[PDB]
Ligand binder design. Structure first.
Ligand SMILES: *C(=O)/C=C\c1ccc(O)cc1
Length: 125
């Protein structure tokens, strides 16, 4: 497994050398989003969590199509402000109840090394 801890202070240099294949090795759910909210990478751990099929989520919009739960000032509002400022590093708890049993999760959003690209990390609590 990829021995990287949730909430690490350097996760972005770490998940830079990783391919999608190496991303599944993560002990937590990893989601990469472009600046518009579209999904570029989805990890199986995220899949084990949300039940969504990684292959069928890449290319879609997280806020609009896949996970309407984050369409609130408490998640999306933070993502949009983070994109606008070009710097995001925030952690919080949330509920994912769209087309699924209400599952309590820990969320960590951070700006990736790359210019317009953002990480979403999730792990059950
Ligand atoms: C609300 O967010 C429900 C579900 C959900 C589905 C997929 C992903 O990635 C997160 C959350």
């Amino acid at each position: 497994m990829e021995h990287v801890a949730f909430g690490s202070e350097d996760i972005e240099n770490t998940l830079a050398k990783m391919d999608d294949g190496q991303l599944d090795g993560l002990a937590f759910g990893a989601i990469q989003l472009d600046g518009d909210g579209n999904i570029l990478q989805y990890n199986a751990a995220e899949g084990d969590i949300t039940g969504r099929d990684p292959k069928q989520v890449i290319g879609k919009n997280f806020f609009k199509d896949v996970a309407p739960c984050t369409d609130s000032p408490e998640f999306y509002g933070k993502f949009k402000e983070g994109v606008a400022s070009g710097n995001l590093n925030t952690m919080f708890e949330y509920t994912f109840d769209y087309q699924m049993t209400p599952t309590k999760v820990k969320v960590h959003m951070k700006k990736a090394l790359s210019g317009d690209s953002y990480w979403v990390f999730v792990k059950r609590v």
